[PDB]
Design a binder for these strands. Sequence first.
RNA 1: CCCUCGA
DNA 2: TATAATGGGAGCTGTCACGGATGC
DNA 3: GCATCCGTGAGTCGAGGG
Lengths: 94, 55, 101, 170, 147, 14, 221, 1112, 56
Amino acid sequence: AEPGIDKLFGMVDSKYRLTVVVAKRAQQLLRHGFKNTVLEPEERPKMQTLEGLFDDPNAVTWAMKELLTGRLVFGENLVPEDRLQKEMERLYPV
Amino acid sequence: KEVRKVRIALASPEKIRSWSYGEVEKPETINYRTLKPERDGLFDERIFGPIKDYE
Amino acid sequence: PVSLETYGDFIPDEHLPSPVDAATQSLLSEELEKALSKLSEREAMVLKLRKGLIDGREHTLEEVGAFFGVTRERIRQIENKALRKLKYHESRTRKLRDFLD
Amino acid sequence: RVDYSGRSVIVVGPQLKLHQCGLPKRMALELFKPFLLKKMEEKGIAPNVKAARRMLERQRDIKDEVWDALEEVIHGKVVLLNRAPTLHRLGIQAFQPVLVEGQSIQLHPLVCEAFNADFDGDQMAVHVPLSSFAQAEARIQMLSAHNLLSPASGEPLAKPSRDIILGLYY
Amino acid sequence: YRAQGVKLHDKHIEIVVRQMMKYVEVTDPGDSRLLEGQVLEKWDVEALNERLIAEGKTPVAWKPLLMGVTKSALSTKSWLSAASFQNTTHVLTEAAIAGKKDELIGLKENVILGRLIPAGTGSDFVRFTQVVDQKTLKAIEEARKEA
Amino acid sequence: SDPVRQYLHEIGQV
Amino acid sequence: FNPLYVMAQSGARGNPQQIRQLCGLRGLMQKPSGETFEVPVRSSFREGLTVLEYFISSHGARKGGADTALRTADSGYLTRKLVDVTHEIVVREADCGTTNYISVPLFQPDEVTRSLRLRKRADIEAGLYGRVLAREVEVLGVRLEEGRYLSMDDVHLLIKAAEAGEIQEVPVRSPLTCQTRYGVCQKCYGYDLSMARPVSIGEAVGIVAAQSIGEPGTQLT
Amino acid sequence: MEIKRFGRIREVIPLPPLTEIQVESYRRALQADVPPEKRENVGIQAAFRETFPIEEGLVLDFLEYRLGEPPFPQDECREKDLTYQAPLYARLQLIHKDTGLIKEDEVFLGHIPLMTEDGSFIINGADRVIVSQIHRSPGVYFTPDPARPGRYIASIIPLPKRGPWIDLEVEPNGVVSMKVNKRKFPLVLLLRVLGYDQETLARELGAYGELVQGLMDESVFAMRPEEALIRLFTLLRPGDPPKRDKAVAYVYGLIADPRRYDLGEAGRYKAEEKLGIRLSGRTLARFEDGEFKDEVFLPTLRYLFALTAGVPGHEVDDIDHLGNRRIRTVGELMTDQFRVGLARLARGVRERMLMGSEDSLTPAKLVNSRPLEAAIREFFSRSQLSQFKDETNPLSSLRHKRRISALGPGGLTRERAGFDVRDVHRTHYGRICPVETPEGANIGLITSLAAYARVDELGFIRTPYRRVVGGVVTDEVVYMTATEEDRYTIAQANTPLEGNRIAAERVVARRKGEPVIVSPEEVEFMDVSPKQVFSVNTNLIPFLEHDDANRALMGSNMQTQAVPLIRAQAPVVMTGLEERVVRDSLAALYAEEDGEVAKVDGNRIVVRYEDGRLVEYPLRRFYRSNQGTALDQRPRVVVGQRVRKGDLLADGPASENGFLALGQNVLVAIMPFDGYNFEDAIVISEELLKRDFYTSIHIERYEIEARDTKLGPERITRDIPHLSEAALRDLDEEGVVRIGAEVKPGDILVGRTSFKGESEPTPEERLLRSIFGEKARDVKDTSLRVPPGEGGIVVRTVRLRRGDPGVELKPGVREVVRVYVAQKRKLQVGDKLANRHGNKGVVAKILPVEDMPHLPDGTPVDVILNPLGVPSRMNLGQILETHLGLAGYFLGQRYISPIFDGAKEPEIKELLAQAFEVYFGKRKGEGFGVDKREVEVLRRAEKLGLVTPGKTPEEQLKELFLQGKVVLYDGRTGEPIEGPIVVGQMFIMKLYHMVEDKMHARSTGPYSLITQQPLGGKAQFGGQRFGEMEVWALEAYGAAHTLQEMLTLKSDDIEGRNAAYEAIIKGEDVPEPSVPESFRVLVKELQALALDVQTLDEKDNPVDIFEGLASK
Amino acid sequence: PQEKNSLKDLVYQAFLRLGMEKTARLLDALKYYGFTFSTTSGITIGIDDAVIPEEK
RNA sequence: CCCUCGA
DNA sequence: TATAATGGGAGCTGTCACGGATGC
DNA sequence: GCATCCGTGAGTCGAGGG
Ligand SMILES: [Mg+2]
Ligand SMILES: [Zn+2]
């Protein structure tokens, strides 16, 4: 099973809201090249290559683990969409 | 715009003629030697548009 | 002729471009724009006018020459030097070779 | 009918974890092929995409590094497994694929009961969710280990059966 | 179902049956534009009756109507759903004549048009949800704070 | 029902 | 520890009837007319049948097969009908706020019509578990509150109270009584039987219902 | 090795030729060997006799016909994709009535397909089989009215498309009604037309009270037969002018015309027998001396009234009874379509007699052969009873030729077929097998002919019985119809016999299918053998009596699915039918007469017979069958060997020394293994691959064409633009791959170039062209390449060129090249295995030999089967087969155990004892005692009640061995299996379903024209179908974007799919999906229906999904 | 003795807490050990394992 | 398409 | 472009349940 | 108010051959 899936289902009033949050966050991480991540270098999801451990390419993995850290804010009408876009482009260039 | 609805109703002959880019006057499809659409036929390029892009 | 209803499920569309083909043309246009960005604006524009990447058609040396306000020999020479720099850059980075099929 | 899909015979997976399924290498190579190309361009396996695709085209042109590349590609991702007929929603489930040798799809034992799947020669279809949204939906909602119970009853759906019960009882 | 050892929850059957009871027949038109014997949805006639009672008019007298799943399906408001189900010709004739509009409420309608279904992740309830990290959130907060 | 029969009858009128 | 006995008892494989056909007598058989033959197969599969026995048994088996196929077709049709009639139904809201409900009886009239006796556990469970109380229920010194999602333990407790004669029926929120338009609410639907918890808004319970009713259609004999 | 056979029942007669149904039907049909004057009026001769004479020159008549030699031999027809056929010439004479002029000529009617020696056909190079049809026999039937109790329906049924079904019913108002072509009218009218008078009807039918009074109508008897006739014609033909000759012609055509209305010979027979009358012709009435004369109707009505009244000697009919159901064989069907094409030919002939010069006409001028040819071609190609032959193994073909279908032309339509038709009738005994039949929708509709069963001249199936007189069983054998059978008391074949006399005072018999215990004095007849109850395939299952019918069925069918193996061996446990199955399938080669073998080769076998003549038998070698299985004959004899008549010269495919080999004999252990045999899955030893057990040869055909186009010709050449030498390496000078070359997916089988379509180069193409300074070539690479997942060694190349001797292709085609590729297939994971008892599974694991459970002597098992399969499936035959297989393993012998006659338990126990003596005796001889692990195991079994406490280890081990169980050591541990395990030899087949064929995956590929959705099929590299129910699934998970992905990006959304692919190769996220194209197609197809479909916003203002391109 | 029903109930309670998560894990464990012990058990089918009672 | 064969 | 020629020919069957109009 | 004819339905995916 997905790690801490239970706690995640506990976070939200509907499981589908969890899904949306996770997917959206994953898209944010893809877009900005994981420069917006709230995960400390030791908290980074890893992948075992032939060479050695590298960053987990999967943005949804990242999204869920981020979500579990309590460092993400979700909900409806938090901020204008274009304002969010522009500020994320500001802080983390693409 | 975003589609919020789908409507269906009867088509007036005037509406039908409004759709039409031409009348098909001939029961012809394609020429036997040239394999190209016959004029005023079911496959006519004059009516239903070009076979080749931008040509 | 015979009927599609005896059948047509086995009949592919050769007309519309495959996603692979379309992606290939896209990457082609983009790469071309890179290699042309490696040139000056005038010579790149001359190449685009002469090969018709702008309005869709190929202008003569008289039309491009009268466009930039020069002689046809001059504009042909510009086309040639542009093509030459393109050949040097391509020989160097070997980027556009794969698109030649 | 859809793209990014495949099918093959199913075979028992006993070593598999519940969230996993064996996916033949070739199948995975084809299904994920664009991702594989992009990854091959990210590493030094190919200068560009077209060269990489022309490289995968012939089977004798396929080397060892592309498989590791494919492994990197499918990491964390899930595929949809489906057996016909689909009577209820558990006719489709999500699995993190494990690349295997051979042409057969490996299926975890428990979920068999839901699929009404046995090893008398049943075949199954594979599907690849593309978007982050699709894969999120699949992993959270459609994962095998995330549905343990029947939506019809509320009794356990994935449960010990056959050999398992026999052993534990024994 | 019990006879065969199939454990099945009542509420599903209750869903279906609920859809079987979905329609009513008019015993008296009252002050409405409705006709005697005219069949419509219980919801619609209840709304109509609440409107007539709120207007001080005489409400519509109606009768409960039980129809099987096929008839209940074909009698639904969405012409797309009904036409896709079966008896396509009939459905389409009556729909075209009535100049019917499909509001795209259910799953079939949006599936045909290839839209995002109104269920699960597509639910208007959960689909407008936003996600932001505390850094970006605070930056935006300062942006709002300055003006 | 049958167009041929009908036209043949109509022809059998004259 | 006999293999057949072990497998049958455990639930790994086999039922008493199959075991009976192996060890015991094969049993009675039906004529093609549905009529039953007077002379049973006295033989087991262990001992082996005579060709006559085998022939009769063949009547039976053929009948069974035809039955199975035709059944598959009709069940499929039914399932699609159900999917078409129920598909617009989704959980669109938390509560419609209706005061309406249904009362699930814990007792059913005896066929002797002597008295009322307790309903079978599984059926009670099937009409109770995962539902929501429309009213306060106080039994055996326990408060089951209005709005409460009934757990399995809640159901079993209600059965205990029933046996103690404290409660003959349970008031419950139901899709039948839900005033939600185009779908049902959360409280009226109750649990998501897959997650053993309350149903998430956006769940399509119409399709889930259609599939739940449809899937064991080919098992119905 | 020594073969011990069991059973006490001596079969009086052997199995009849098993292909005889086909061969003799068609031989009866053509009558090619019969000199024309001696030909019977049956067959195509019949069709000629019905069609001719042709009148209104005035007259064209039929003299005789003949069949010439085939233009090409069978193999050559298969090669060139022709039809194996013979030319049909018919001698006709034209006669002018007035002139007296007679012009006679032999005209060419086209060809007719010739049936091969094994009962098949070659149609356009493909082997095909015409499957017999089963249908209700023509005749007069009486059935109970479902609505009205006590009332019955009379039904007069002729042959299919021989004219209408007629119903006679007694209406609630009392009048007797006749129903023809869905028209209800009083029968009395027709009775008047037939020339009957009220007097005759009163004396004849008056014996039945209150019945005949419904038949009395004064208005009908008030008019002569002519007036009544015209009345009937006015009733049956509204609006049509009631002319006298037109009415006479119509009714005569409906009833008395043999050219139109024909009861079968069978129909006539059954009518005569039922109604107790005699029919002059096969029609219901006659036209004689200007008036209609009755045959059928009055006896039919008489029987109806009699049955209605309760009069004894009158009963209803069972329409599923095999006395009332007959079989239409290949000859009858072919003859029917022949009659059709001939009728069309006749229409053409009269049409040609009306137009053209009247004085000069020849038969050649009047006859256009084409419609007949067209009819026959339609039959042998597009008919439903004409099926692609199953060549997978020989038994496949044999069974295919023995099939019976209720479907087809004139047959039942599915889903209208209830339980009754699929049911097993009591009359099925000895005739139609109760076991072999498909699973699913076709169940009971497709069936198989019993082993001893025969089809008679009237088309009824007959089964043999033995005469029993005074308790003495003779060798006299009588084949009976189901009716004749119902006339007798027939004892079972296992009935005790001392000499020819019945030794039991209580015998088991049947009376009308009803089982009954009777005296020897009462026994009229006795069964030939249990074999006669079952089909060929079902007869190949040993210990069948220990198997439940369903898994027996599975065993049969899967036996037909078995793949020929290079090393394939005959079963250790046989039913004894294997040799005959090989012989009758014409798979193997036999000696025609006694003689000495002169030459022996992998190619030919030359034999000198007693006549002194030298005959050379060529061997078919590595030929590709219809299903792609390898067909090759291996010589079984050596130079100088003395052979007698019927001895084996060579083994065919799936044959070992004349015995049918559908698979391998492997050593199995019944026990779970670590979840790998979970749910019917199977585990195998790698040793099986090492010695090449279950290894098969498969050949695939690849075909390309070079044709003339308007843009210039396609051509096969070694010059292919933009290709290296590496790709052209194995290509020969002409562009064809060389023999012996290994091909892999992507490799070129045949090089081909086609001129490019007219091309306006995109500006990018022009620029790039100018950059690399290379002219774009005129042609492009069309070459035929090896498809994904295929490949092998090229064993053959066929090239056919236009402008070359003996070669003329389709118009426009320059040449055709065929490439044959053979592949050797090892058994691999996903491949399907089965036994004859219905146990089937895919191999889920292949273990290295060191991981396999093994006997103490170090012998590893081959296959590991999970016991959990056995109890619910209730097939114990595999168990007994396993025990006896163990015995035969250590005794080095094979066994023949006839069904229901087979080896019983005690005999198997004896053999197992001997085997144990070999096993353990050898052990103790070698100087080793009992192993400790064996002791532990023995303690466990001692606790299990398997062995007697107090006995020595050897005694207990023997006790276990007789139970079929042995001590087994886990290969990974060395620790024994805690209990003893059943281990023995089992016969297992490798089924035709192989994962190599079935594995498919697609990223992107071809899309359909109109729908712009992915194509279906593996060959077309299609996408899987996501159907209504899968969409239901995704809806139920509530996954919206995955679903939307299925409905747009991955299928019919062009913008969406292109954007998606590009986004993914760029490394981006897939974009928002657009409108699906097939919905636009829906909008447009709805517009053509004059329906306006508008996509609107929330403000009800139109939205254009066509982006302006559809608007003016 | 552990059989179909008991194991099912185990999976259900466990399923509540141990639950979703550790019931995924528990399911896998039971699978493993179940298969192993089934293998070493000695389970097979002989013809003498179908036992005709004399009572018959 | 229909037929046949798989699930 | 001229003897006169003047109403066609297929037929094809062993299902069942519902709505709807149609006929005593 | 009750029989009778007419139209429309009757599981999925997969394979193969035509
Ligand atoms: Mg299966
Ligand atoms: Zn509610």
